[PDB]
Structure 1
Amino acid sequence: MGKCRGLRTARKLRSHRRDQKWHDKQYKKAHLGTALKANPFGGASHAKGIVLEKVGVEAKQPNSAIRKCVRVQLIKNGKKITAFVPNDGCLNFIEENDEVLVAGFGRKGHAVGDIPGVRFKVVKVANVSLLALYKGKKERPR
């Protein structure tokens, strides 16, 4: 029970807990403010940038495909980031020097699937929603 049991010993128990909390990764991340300091997105949920170039990335085994992302300079901190472009032929819709709204995978910062070193996805261009673009609700305005 690895832990005193004296009526007094609040301070030891209280503090021993403070000492071990660290190992928790979610906890440490939060106390070290990692999201502000290391992370490309601010510690925000979405982030907008300009498209530098279009990449065809080489999906990891045992899968085999050309992935199709763009490389993006985030306006907020000039950070360089590669982001996936989802659905069929949607690259089509984003051109070099584009602008785009990027969002996390939903993986906690950890890349997704077979898609290697890509941690973000495009959501908007034409300020304009790949979904609405892919469907043809709305266009590549211009």
Structure 2
Amino acid sequence: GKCRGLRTARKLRSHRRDQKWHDKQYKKAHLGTALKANPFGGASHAKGIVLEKVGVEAKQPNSAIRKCVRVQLIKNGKKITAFVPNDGCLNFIEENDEVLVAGFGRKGHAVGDIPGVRFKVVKVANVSLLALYKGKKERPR
């Protein structure tokens, strides 16, 4: 069992300090390696330039082609893959466009059929994809 003395505070506190590092959430947050490997660098959104249009085939048992885009981040030069959410929204994006990119819902984890993709597109050329999709705004000319 555990020690239960009146002069045990140092033992209890040091043991808790040591054993907190075996919690993977705590270690990930407090170690610093997961902050340097994050392409966004701790930000919720980031801007980037479109390099290529890609198509990622879904994981089994699903059979489809999720339509994504390869994006190079402006602030650090890193390269990511971002999923274009809705029906036919890839037709609004063109190469060399500047896009706003956000996380994809699971704090750095992949979501659903889409393998290895952690990001999604929000805006293209300062126009939200929702407004384009619902016909509220059009691409600037």
Q: Displacement of 1:106 after TM fit?
A: 1.2
TM superposition shift of 1:28: 1.1
% identity of equivalent residues? 100
User: Does structure 2 retain, via aligned residues, the 8 Å contact 1:69–1:85?
Assistant: yes
Separation (CA, whole Å) in 2 of partners of 1:97 and 1:3: 62
CA contact (8 A) 1:21 1:27 kept: yes
Is the CA contact (8 Å cut-off) linking 1:35 and 1:43 kept in structure 2?
Answer: no
TM-score where L is the length of structure 1: 0.95
CA RMSD of aligned residues (A): 1.0
Change (3 A) 1:11 1:108: same
The structure where strand makes up a greater share of residues is 2
Figure out how many residues of one structure are paired with residues of the other and give that number. Answer: 141
Gaps of 5+ in 1: none
Question: Is this contact kept in 2: 1:35–1:42, CA < 8 A?
Answer: no
Runs of 4+ off more than 4 Å: none
TM-score by length of 2: 0.96
Task: Quote how far apart the aligned CAs of 1:30 are.
Answer: 1.7
How big is the shift at 1:127? 1.1
Give CA-to-partner distance per residue, 1:18-72, whole Å, 9 cap, x none. 0111112221122113453110111010011000000011010000111000000
Report SS of the residue matched to 1:57: strand
1:81-130 superposed Cα distances (whole Å, 9 cap, x missing partner): 00000000000111111111110011111011000111000000021100
| SS of aligned partner of 1:40 | coil
1:6 positional shift = 0.8
Alignment correspondent of 1:127: 126
